[PDB]
């Protein structure tokens, strides 16, 4: 294949230069598990057991014993296939554009296939990270003109049936009020028997700037860490800053029994076999990726929104 497909050879050679997605920092290694699918839906079944009565004492002869029951629950997950197209120089035309220590038309913004694919893959990975964090697909800083997605396709921020808190616009700069809302949400959290787990907090730059302020010789960040430690059995609490958010705070456990990410094993960018060729030196190529696969239990994510107006 490599003897025939120069583009496949180039992809195999330059696949290592693409940086790792930053969304991996938001999950534990056990929380992520790939699935084999491109587009469609997939049903997940979770089994449980419960005790029906007090246990039976085994003495002398007895036939009536307490029972253990079972239960099941089914959750549907949707997966969507998306594609992009990019232009590049034809393989046989690179010799006519190899300049001094650089290849490609500076005037016409034409690149070799390997560099074009690397840059496009990086951009697509950034878009995938944005979708996973926010649950929406948009290329604008406002967050508008969002692409319409299927139901059962949510991010960490828009997952339904979770603890939503809202800070009024009048208290947009009152860290005491923000922390009061955070404490209320933390109290409303329901971890059950899986409370002994590390916790992850994701904030925006303005929230981090407010956090590093003194607590009204302790900081709001230290107070928040202590409060979360009071509920997570004195375990690790990680704090992260993301520019993708705007006046939002996300708190969730890094436990595979509560939140599980099951992406398609084709989620990350993959070249398409089709290449558009003509009589000129310009060709076109396609990159595929797959979105969807976040699964969570009810009342395990705290989402705080600080209204600005």
């Amino acid at each position: 294949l490599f003897d025939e497909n120069y583009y496949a050879k180039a992809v195999a050679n330059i696949i290592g230069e693409v940086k790792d997605p930053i969304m991996y920092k938001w999950f534990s290694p056990d929380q992520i598990e790939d699935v084999d699918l491109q587009m469609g839906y997939q049903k997940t079944v979770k089994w449980d057991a419960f005790l029906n009565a007090n246990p039976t004492t085994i003495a002398n002869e007895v036939n009536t014993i307490s029972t253990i029951g079972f239960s099941s629950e089914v959750v549907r997950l949707n997966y969507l296939k998306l594609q992009y197209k990019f232009r590049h120089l034809k393989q046989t035309s690179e010799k006519f554009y190899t300049s001094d220590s650089y290849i490609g038309d500076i005037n016409n913004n034409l690149l070799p296939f390997a560099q074009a694919y690397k840059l496009a893959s990086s951009e697509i990975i950034k878009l995938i990270n944005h979708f996973v964090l926010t649950g929406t697909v948009s290329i604008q800083k406002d967050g508008k003109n969002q692409k319409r997605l299927l139901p059962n396709m949510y991010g960490l921020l828009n997952m339904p049936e979770q603890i939503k808190e809202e800070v009024a616009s009048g208290d947009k700069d009152k860290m005491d009020k923000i922390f009061e809302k955070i404490e209320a949400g933390l109290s409303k959290l329901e971890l059950g028997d899986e409370f002994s787990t590390p916790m992850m907090v994701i904030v925006d730059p303005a929230t981090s700037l407010k956090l590093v302020k003194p607590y009204a010789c302790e900081k709001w960040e230290d107070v928040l860490i202590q409060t979360i430690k009071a509920i997570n059995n004195r375990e690790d609490v990680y704090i992260e800053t993301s520019n993708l958010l705007k006046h939002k705070i996300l708190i969730y456990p890094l436990n595979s029994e509560l939140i599980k990410f099951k992406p398609s094993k084709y989620m990350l960018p993959t070249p398409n076999e089709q290449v558009d060729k003509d009589s000129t030196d310009v060709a076109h190529s396609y990159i595929d990726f797959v979105l969807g696969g976040l699964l969570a239990t009810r009342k395990t994510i705290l989402q705080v929104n600080i209204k600005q107006s």
Partner: protein, 37 residues
């Protein structure tokens, strides 16, 4: 079948895509191995 293996030689585009997926999975595993918090 992984692109990180020098001796690996794909036969067709399907095997190439499988190798790409395996490479991404191995890179994720390596990232979690090297991650420090």
């Amino acid at each position: 079948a992984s692109l990180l293996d020098s001796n690996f030689v794909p036969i067709n585009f399907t095997e190439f895509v499988q190798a790409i997926s395996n490479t991404y999975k191995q890179r994720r595993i390596q990232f979690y191995e090297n991650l420090k918090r």
